[PDB]
Design a protein around this ligand. Sequence first.
Ligand SMILES: CCOc1cc(C(=O)N2CCC(N3CCN(C)CC3)CC2)ccc1Nc1ncc2c(n1)N(C1CCCC1)c1ccccc1C(=O)N2C
Length: 108
Amino acid sequence: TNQLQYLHKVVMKALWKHQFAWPFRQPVDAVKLGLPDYHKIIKQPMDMGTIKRRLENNYYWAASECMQDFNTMFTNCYIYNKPTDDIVLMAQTLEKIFLQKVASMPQE
Ligand SMILES: CCOc1cc(C(=O)N2CCC(N3CCN(C)CC3)CC2)ccc1Nc1ncc2c(n1)N(C1CCCC1)c1ccccc1C(=O)N2C
């Protein structure tokens, strides 16, 4: 759809290249990060690499599902980390761009 095309070529294009994008371009590696509780707390991991792959393979049936994947990625970050962590602020900056671009998505 026009909306999924927009999410791929506008929203993800802007978010993927952002200076703050790098921790979100692939799954949280709880083993490399020394986080034995990450998967005990975060039951649905999500990342931009997964979302990008889903958009490339036409995995989504509705723009709202892709939006939920973005939202889950950000919420995972806010829920697992501590309020003062830099990563929370990076998520907030990316999420603001996400919402700003979503405000201009084509209707269906
Ligand atoms: C794919 C790996 O990516 C990461 C990379 C680095 C990294 O600096 N080096 C630095 C030098 C690199 N060289 C340089 C020389 N060359 C020849 C070879 C390559 C090697 C790797 C750190 C963390 C990463 N990965 C991450 N992925 C999700 C999260 C995440 N870190 N952080 C953030 C903390 C501050 C910024 C990222 C979290 C940390 C704890 C708990 C949760 C989260 C979290 O919520 N997220 C989403």
